[PDB]
Each structure stands twice: as C-alpha cells, then as structure tokens.
C-alpha cells in the first residue's frame, strides 16, 4: 500500500496526456491580437508609511482596503482619494486583508495566527473587531469572504479552513498540502475554491464535500499567487519561477506558459481582466505586467512603482486596476 | 465644486491623515529588535530576564528610549517566505547555547547553519546581529570533563573556558560573510537584571550612530 | 444617546447656557447639528460644529447671536446663548452626524430641551400640509425644492424625517433613495429634479405623525413646513 501511488500517478499523467490533442497557442494563432494597450495613473494614494502587503476591491467597485505594517488598515474612495476609515489592527505584522462582498465586514491576518474580522458598519461609528477567529498553527497566509458569515482562509500549517463566523469556530480543515499555502482565490459561483502552496503544486478543493477535487503541477518553485478566469473554468499561477501557468479544471491540463527571457525576478501577484483577455501578474522588478492570455505575448507594462509589486487587484467592473507596492503608495490605472 | 458632505468627507480624511501622521511619529520613536535562536537557546530566559502560537512582542524602556522584540520561534514554518518582513529591524538579537555542543538534535551545527542562514540572507545586509552566549556556568561546570573535541575536530588548544569561549565565539563571528557592511556584538549571558539591557542599549545605540554617519557620508 | 439639559424660563434680552451629554458612542469623530422647533410651527436649523471644531456654520437668523462648542475629553456639546428675543422661544434637539460614502447624516435626534422667553436660502414647500389616513392604506407625500438638489456627482442631497406625537425626529430616508438603519421595508422614496416623493405601503399604528423634508446641498440647511398624518 506504498508502492501503488506512483503507478496511480502515471495513469493519471497518461490519461492527461491523451487529451492534450492540440495546444492553446496553435488554435488561437488566428485571433486579432490585442496591440499595445498603454495605461497612466489616474489616482496614487498616500498616507500609509510602512510597506502595503494587500489590497481588495468592494463589490460596489469604488471602495478598497489595503494593509500595511504600519497596524493600520485604510478604507480609501478611489473615486475621490479620500479615507473612509483607519482600523488600527492589534498585531501591525499583516499579510492579507479582505473586504466582504456586501461591504459590512473587513478581515486581516498575518504572522500572529488569530484573523480578526471587523465590523464597519456600526452603529456606534466606530470600527471594532466584531471577532477573533484563532486555530491555524502556522502564520496567516490569506482570506476571502464568501458571504456575512462564511470565511475561507490559508495559513502555514498546509492546511486550509473553511469558518462559521456566527459561532466563532471551523466548519472544515482542508488538508493534503505538502507545503505552506501562499494564496487563495474563490471562484465566481463560490462553489469550489483552488488555493497554491509552496510544494509547486495547485490544489482545486470543494467547500461542502471537504475533499480535494483535483491536483495540478508544472511549476518548479513555490506558487505565490493565484487567480481564477472570470467563467470559473480556468485558473492562472503564479511563482518564483518568472512563470504564469493557465490551468482549466475540466481539462486538467496546463495550457500556456507566460514568461519572457530577460524576466528572471519572482512573481507576487496575478489578476485578470473582466473580459479574461488580459492576465495582470505583479512581478518584483519594480513593474507590472500585462500578458495576452490567449496570445502569450506581452501587450504592456505599468512600471509606476520603486520598491516592489506586492498586491494587484481589478475592479468587479473592470474600470480600473489598482496596484499597491512597498513603496507604501497605491497607483490606480 | 464640492457638496457638503464631500466638503466634510474631506476634512475627515484630512483628520485622519493627521491622526496617522501623529501615529507614525510615535512609532518611529522605538526601536524594532528581532529575536531568533534555537528551541533550547534560552530565548525564554534573557526575554524574561530583561523585561524590567505566533509572533509575540515585549516592550520595555530603558533610559528612555522604547524597545520591542519580535520573537519568531513559535512559527514552525518555512522563513523565507516571511523573514523579509523584518527588514527595517534596527538589529537582531541572536541566542546560542554554549551547553549544546554535546548534545543531539551537534545543536551547535544546526546554530550554526542557523546563524549562517540568517545573518547572509539578502534581507539583513546592512542590519547588525547581536549575539549572546547562554548558559556560561553551564559551559564552564561541563568543560573541563567533556573535550570541546566531541564537536569540532580542528580545535587545537586546552580545555579551559577562557580559550574554549574564544574559541566558540570566533568561529561564531568567521561565519560572517560581509564583515565590511555588518558588524557582530558577542555577549556573555550572565544572570543580572540590568547588565544584559545596558549591553542591548549600547549595542544598539552605537549601530544607530553608524548608520547616521553613513548616511550623511561620513562613514 | 443623547440628552439636553439647560433650559427653562429667561427673561429677553439675557444670556442662557444650553448644554447636552454624549454618551455610548465616539462622540469625537462625529459632527453636531442644533435644531429647533417653535411651540407650533416646524423645525428651524440653527447651528453646526464639525468633528475637531475644524468647521462651524450658524443661520442667518442666528449670526454673531449664537455660538456653539465642543469639549471631546468629557463628550459634552455646548451653545451659549446671549441677547434672548421672544422668535427664540423653542424647544431645541440636538442631532447627530457623521460624514463619509456611505454615511447616514442625521441619524439620532436627542429627547430636546425647551428654553421659553417671556413675550437666498433654498425654499421648500410641502402644500399637502395634512392627509386623512386608515390603517391599512397606502400613502404618498409629495415635495417640492427651488433649487435642484442634484448634484453634478449623482448624489440627491435630500433627507425625509418622521415626528411622532411627543417624540423626537427619527431619520426615515436619506439622499432620496437609502432607508435609514432601523426602518420597515414599507418606505420608499424616489423622485427627479426639483420634485420628490415619498411612500408608504399599508401605513399601521405609530406611523401618524409630521414627516419634514431637508435638503443638504448648500447651507444653510432648510427644512419643510411639514405633512402631518391622522
């Protein structure tokens, strides 16, 4: 019971190798290609000091959150630059925050394990945490809302846990990770979430059975960020490698490969545009990318930064991507 | 023109930004110290000692100036993907323990290699470390009936503590690999209430210095 | 909560210290508006003080007469009084404000304090003054601005208050289209420019009452003469 694994392992190889009839790159060899798509800073955003780790998008598409080290979390309006809020976090050593999809609670985390969950709309105005999730041994690693009350978060432990927020308490510990868990993403229906870890591999997990679904591979580092195709069927990679991966759950199979000689830095952070024609990945060399996801080819860079591209993040409506970095500043383009 | 709520809102994110700008003032006042060292080091001691399942901070304050300390033992996870985030500590406060030279997982390898991995991490280039050796009357009582032998093979000296501490400490300090841009204070533990934070203060107010004076060119 | 103290009779021409305690929220951080209603006509905005005493405005029919202070570090509110005239017998509420997206001004209206002296404004206009209503039956409330109160951002600065008999206001819908926090499902408002109105469906017990309208474009802030309901 100890030597069948990696025959198992070799049927599942072959059998994706029998449905890898033709590659994505030779069917849309035929499409117009997308040109030269040049983007300026609408908006920069100051008054955090520390380095900025995070950032999300309200539903509404006008609200944002960012974390830095400075303990602070900051509402900012994009449309006018002001500050809605200043959430003074108990532990300043975040590393994710999120913004729920109605826009009544705010999360964050990092290496003190304990997520808190804040409460913005209260009546006594305000801000206070409305709880402390706590039970991840290793460091928080990230968070997303799937509604009022239910929460999805990452952590060092290589495990994932799914929260009832209502009683305070894990309804389901993801499990199976050789690795720590670097991010995760929620797919459109909230149905199935795909999380990353640092063994390389791309883990596709239901939130109701409990059980992972499905496993992908191809990278040969640490997969840091991670994001799915707007649809729901696809989901981009990305690692230290200087590699996006596109992946499609149906297929089961890698698809393109999204790198260039002359990039040998590590990737932060991925998104997608609206449309899923354009894949934002942040990479560390002090820019931002923007790759064709059906071309592989570049179509533009959004170099606005001096430190480091640590978070990146898309509008619901596409608008706008906003784009925070260590240089403690966020540019809207 | 703007209405006014938005005249209102404004001076609300005004407030704010003053607020914050107060808030950062306050804390770039106080310095920011790492600790680190192996489960048995002793980082338990010397933090109880000075202070007059995550990251844990202590403050204290000692002839008015602030002190914290990040302890990041309880993280039983892999480092590189958050050691970065202490990259503006003022300085780091290593631990070793000279009693773990005969003792398994070879402790003193595995500090060591530690030690290594930390102070050539390309995140800490221009931040010094601060070394403390624990446990000296521990080392003293067990040498003189166990050879320093049992762990380096290339020692080549007496069996007394005034050399054999020597001996640890310079091995300790060859390991740095940038000694023109970083700088190694060595300390002995010994068991006081003030003398270890006098030392910290010192150590850290001369690093400052340094860091000043290479700032404005002069060194 | 918020509670008024300071009242009662002065002879005219005196001066009065009006004073009220904030108490159970962060009174720092939110504004203050001082309102007040004669013994038989509707409410009249008087004075207002931002978060940090950063702004402070006064009406016209107030200037230089009335000043109003704050104190955080006790979470008290102040308004002194001088050279009293018999137009400023009213009984006086305090309210509360904050201001950001999102935000619901005016939200908490204070039990009020009566003070009693021996004796280019935007206009409103509410012509349906009083409605015969059963229980039951739907209703609607009409109003009307001369200036239109919305502005190039898309925002509709108006706001619709409800007065029960011996009550203090209570916020039902601000910016035309937002229920207050608390309010049945049974209100609606909408309405375009220069013209607004306001819904109730299977209007119940308790709902009987003036509902005053206020615009918040521009000070100074201008409130309706009232609907009143029975």
């Known amino acids: 019971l100890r030597q069948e694994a990696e025959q198992l392992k070799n049927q599942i190889r072959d059998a994706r190798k029998a449905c890898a009839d033709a590659t994505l790159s030779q069917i849309t060899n035929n499409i117009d290609p997308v040109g030269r798509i040049q983007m300026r800073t609408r908006r920069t955003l100051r008054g955090h000091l520390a380095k900025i780790y995070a950032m999300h998008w309200g539903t509404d598409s006008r609200l944002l959150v960012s974390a830095s080290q400075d303990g602070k979390l900051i509402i900012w309006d994009s449309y006018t630059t002001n500050k809605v809020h200043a959430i003074p976090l108990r532990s300043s050593w975040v590393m994710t925050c999120a913004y729920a999809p109605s826009g009544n609670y705010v999360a964050c985390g990092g290496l003190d394990n304990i997520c808190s969950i804040y409460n913005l709309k209260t009546r006594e105005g305000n801000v206070r945490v409305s709880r402390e999730l706590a039970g991840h041994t290793g460091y928080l690693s990230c968070c997303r809302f799937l509604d009022d009350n239910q929460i999805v978060t990452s952590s060092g432990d290589t495990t994932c846990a799914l929260w009832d927020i209502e009683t305070g308490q894990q309804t389901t510990t993801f499990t199976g990770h050789t690795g720590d868990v670097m991010s995760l993403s929620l797919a459109p229906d909230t149905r199935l979430f795909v999380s990353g870890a640092c063994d390389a591999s791309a883990k596709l997990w239901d939130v109701r059975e409990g059980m992972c679904r499905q496993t992908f591979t191809g990278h040969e580092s640490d997969i840091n960020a991670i994001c799915f195709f707007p649809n729901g069927n696809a989901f981009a990679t990305g690692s230290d490698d200087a590699t996006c991966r596109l992946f499609d759950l149906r297929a089961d199979q890698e698809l393109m490969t999204y790198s260039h000689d002359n990039i040998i830095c590590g990737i932060t952070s991925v998104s997608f545009s609206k449309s899923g024609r354009l894949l934002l990945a942040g990479y560390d060399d002090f820019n931002c990318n923007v790759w064709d996801a059906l071309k592989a080819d570049r179509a533009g860079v959004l170099a606005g930064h001096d430190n480091r591209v640590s978070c990146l993040g898309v509008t619901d409506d596409g608008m706008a991507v906003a784009t925070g970095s260590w240089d403690s500043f966020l540019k809207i383009w | 023109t703007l209405s006014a709520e938005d005249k209102a809102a404004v001076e609300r994110s005004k407030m704010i930004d003053r607020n914050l700008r107060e808030d950062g003032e306050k804390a770039a006042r106080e310095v920011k110290l790492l600790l680190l060292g192996a489960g048995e080091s002793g980082k338990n001691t010397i933090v109880k000692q000075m202070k007059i399942t995550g990251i844990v901070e202590t403050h204290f304050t000692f002839k008015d100036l602030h002190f914290k300390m990040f302890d990041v033992g309880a993280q039983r996870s892999e480092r590189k993907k958050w050691i970065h985030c202490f990259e503006g500590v003022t300085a780091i406060i290593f631990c070793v323990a000279l009693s773990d030279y005969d003792l398994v997982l070879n402790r003193m390898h595995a500090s060591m290699k530690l030690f290594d991995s930390i102070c050539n991490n390309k995140w800490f280039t221009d931040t010094s470390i601060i070394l403390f050796l624990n446990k000296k009357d521990l080392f003293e009582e067990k040498i003189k009936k166990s050879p320093l032998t049992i762990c380096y093979p290339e020692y080549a000296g007496s069996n007394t503590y005034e050399e054999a501490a020597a001996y640890i400490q310079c091995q300790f300090e060859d390991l740095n690999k940038r000694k023109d841009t970083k700088e190694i204070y060595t300390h002995f533990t010994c068991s006081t209430d003030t003398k270890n934070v006098q030392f910290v203060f010192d150590a850290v107010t001369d690093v400052i210095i340094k860091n000043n004076l290479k700032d404005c060119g002069l060194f | 909560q918020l509670v008024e103290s300071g009242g009662g009779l002065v002879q005219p021409g005196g001066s009065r210290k009006l004073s009220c305690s904030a108490s159970?929220?962060?009174?720092?951080?939110?504004?203050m508006h001082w309102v007040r209603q004669a013994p038989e006509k509707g409410l009249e905005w008087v004075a207002y003080?931002?978060?940090?005493?950063?702004?402070?405005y006064y009406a016209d029919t107030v200037k230089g007469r009335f000043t109003i202070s704050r104190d955080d570090p006790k979470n008290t509110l102040f308004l002194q009084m001088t050279s009293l005239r018999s137009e400023d017998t009213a009984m006086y509420y305090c309210?509360?404000?904050?201001?950001?997206?999102?935000?619901?001004?005016?939200?908490?209206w204070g039990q009020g304090t009566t003070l009693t002296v021996s004796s280019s404004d935007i206009v409103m206009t509410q012509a349906t003054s009083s409605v015969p209503v059963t229980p039951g039956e739907s209703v609607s409330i009409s109003c009307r601005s001369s200036?239109?109160?919305?502005?190039?951002?898309?925002?509709?600065?108006l706001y619709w208050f409800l007065q029960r008999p011996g009550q203090s206001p209570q916020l039902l819908i601000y910016?035309?289209?937002n229920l207050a926090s608390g309010v049945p499902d049974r209100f609606s408002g909408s309405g375009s420019g220069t013209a607004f109105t306001l819904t109730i469906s299977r209007l119940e017990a308790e709902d009987v009452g003036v509902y005053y309208c206020?615009?918040?474009?521009?000070?100074?802030?201008?409130f309706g003469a009232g609907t009143k309901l029975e």
């Open positions: 309210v509360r404000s904050i201001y950001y997206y999102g935000s619901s001004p005016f939200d908490f």
């Open positions: 159970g929220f962060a009174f720092s951080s939110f504004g």
């Open positions: 003080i931002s978060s940090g005493s950063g702004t402070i």
């Open positions: 200036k239109s109160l919305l502005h190039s951002n898309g925002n509709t600065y």
């Open positions: 910016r035309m289209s």
């Open positions: 206020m615009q918040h474009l521009e000070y100074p802030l201008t």
